[model samples]
Target: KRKLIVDSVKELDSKTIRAQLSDYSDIVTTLDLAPPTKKLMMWKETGGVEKLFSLPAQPLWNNRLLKLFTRCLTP
Candidate 1:
């Protein structure tokens, strides 16, 4: 599996990337705390094309970070 980073985006074919982006979106949304935003709409609202921004750090790599983020988001 890829690292879930955006750098590889340009190297992959755009047509297939779009298709798999849908697949990735579907898979990711299965998370217990996934966001409500849909695939296409999220792109616009979140500026998906933007670089220098990224998904949250994977939890195991930084326990404190995930704990802090989840703590903040918890109601």
Candidate 2:
């Protein structure tokens, strides 16, 4: 099976994306990664873009301050 290649998320239809999401499941399963890279990959495999905004309200608490240092634009 060919690997699904997605460059821009906005360039594809949600339905098509959904289809490929399933199609890429097996491909993504075997990807190699370092510890930090796997951390992000784990979240992608767990919740994906669909559950991106549906995070736990209580927070995971990585010891970073949420007021300024932890904002989306911080890095």
Candidate 3:
């Protein structure tokens, strides 16, 4: 369970990175291709696009996503 939690955190971190990068790109790129496609492979090594699809599509997950992000930046 502890390992799973750590992995989940890493996964979420990757997702956050992907979302931030997508904000600046012309087309939304998948995690695997985004690094190579961006030519920033040296500085950016993690892939994250798949993380978006892994998220639940239902409202509960939607609300949970909001709460997670909201708490992320809070003191």
Candidate 4:
């Protein structure tokens, strides 16, 4: 008898991206907006693109904002 072993896995691609985005969108849309906590949580989860709407005017401010943004973007 032989055992099968998997060594490594690659990163997700477009199909995975589309599926994830679809699920996220559904979660966002179905979220309860009336409660402040829930709204904030939903925003934190799904508001990456919306963050671009309010640009920080100063360089330092932008850098700080980008630090927070990158944290969300990464994980």
Judge candidate 2 at residue 46 and give its lDDT: 56
What does candidate 1's lDDT look like per residue over 1-75, in tens digits? 867776635576788878996777555654464555687565556555442143343323576665665565435
Tally clashing residue pairs in candidate 3.
0
> How do all the candidates rank in terms of TM-score, highest first?
4, 2, 1, 3
Candidate that would win on lDDT: 4
Write down the worst ten-residue block by lDDT for model 4. Answer: 52-61
Top TM-score: which candidate number? 4
Q: Model 2: which ten-residue window has the lowest total lDDT?
A: 66-75
Please give, for residues 1-75, the per-residue lDDT of candidate 2 as tens digits.
659986655577688878986787556666565547877877666566655554444556565544333355323
Which ranges in model 2 have alpha carbons more than 4 Å from their true place? 1-36, 61-75
Residue pairs of candidate 4 with colliding backbone atoms: none
lDDT for each residue of candidate 4 in 1-75, tens digit (9 for 90 to 100)? 448875477677789888896777555655455536976875675466666444333333466566764555532
Error of 3 at 27 (Å): 46
TM-score of model 2 (CA atoms): 0.20
